[PDB]
Amino acid sequence: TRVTVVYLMSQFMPSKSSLALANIEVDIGDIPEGKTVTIMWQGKPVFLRKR
């Protein structure tokens, strides 16, 4: 019963694909001081600024 409940519930967890786009990493050693760079992440464009 325990494993069956856990398994039926696990059918409702996030899909592996959604777990692949959730985390991304950017290289901050490329942007110089005072420059803002735009990237893509989960559709919403993201600004990285060297404040």
Partner 1 sequence: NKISLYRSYSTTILLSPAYSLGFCASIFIVIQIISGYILASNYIASTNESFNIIHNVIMRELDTGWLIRFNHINGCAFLFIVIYMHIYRSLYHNSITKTSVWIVGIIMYILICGIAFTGYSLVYGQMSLWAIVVICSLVTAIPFIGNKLLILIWGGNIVSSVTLQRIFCIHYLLPLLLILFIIIHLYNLHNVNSTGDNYFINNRYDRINFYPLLLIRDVFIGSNILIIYNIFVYYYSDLFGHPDNYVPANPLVTPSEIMPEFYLLPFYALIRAIPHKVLGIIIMVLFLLSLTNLYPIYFIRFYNNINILQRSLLLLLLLDLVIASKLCLLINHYESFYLLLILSILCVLSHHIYNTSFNFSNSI
Partner 2 sequence: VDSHPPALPWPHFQWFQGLDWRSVRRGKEVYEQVFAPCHSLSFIKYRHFEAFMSKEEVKNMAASFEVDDDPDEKGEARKRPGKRFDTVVQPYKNEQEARYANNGALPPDLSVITNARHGGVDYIYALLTGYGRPVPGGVQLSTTQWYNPYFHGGIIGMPPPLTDDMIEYEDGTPASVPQMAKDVTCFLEWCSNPWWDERKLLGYKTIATLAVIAVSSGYYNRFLSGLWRSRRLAFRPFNYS
Ligand X SMILES: CCCCCCCCCCCCCCCCCC(=O)OC[C@H](COP(=O)([O-])OCC[N+](C)(C)C)OC(=O)CCCCCCCCCCCCCCCCC
Binding site for ligand X (CB under 6 A): 8-9, 12
- Distance CA(13)–CA(49), nearest Å, equals 35
- Distance CA(44)–CA(7), nearest Å, equals 33
Site string for partner 1, 16-45 (x = CB under 8 A): xxx---x-------------------x-x-
- Among partner 1, ligand X, partner 2, none, partner that 6 touches (CB below 5 to 8 angstroms by kind): none
Tokens of 46: 């993201």
- Start-to-end C-alpha separation, the chain: 55
Q: Is 13 in the site for partner 2 (CB under 8 A)?
A: no
- Residues near partner 2, by CB under 8 A: 16-17, 20-21, 40
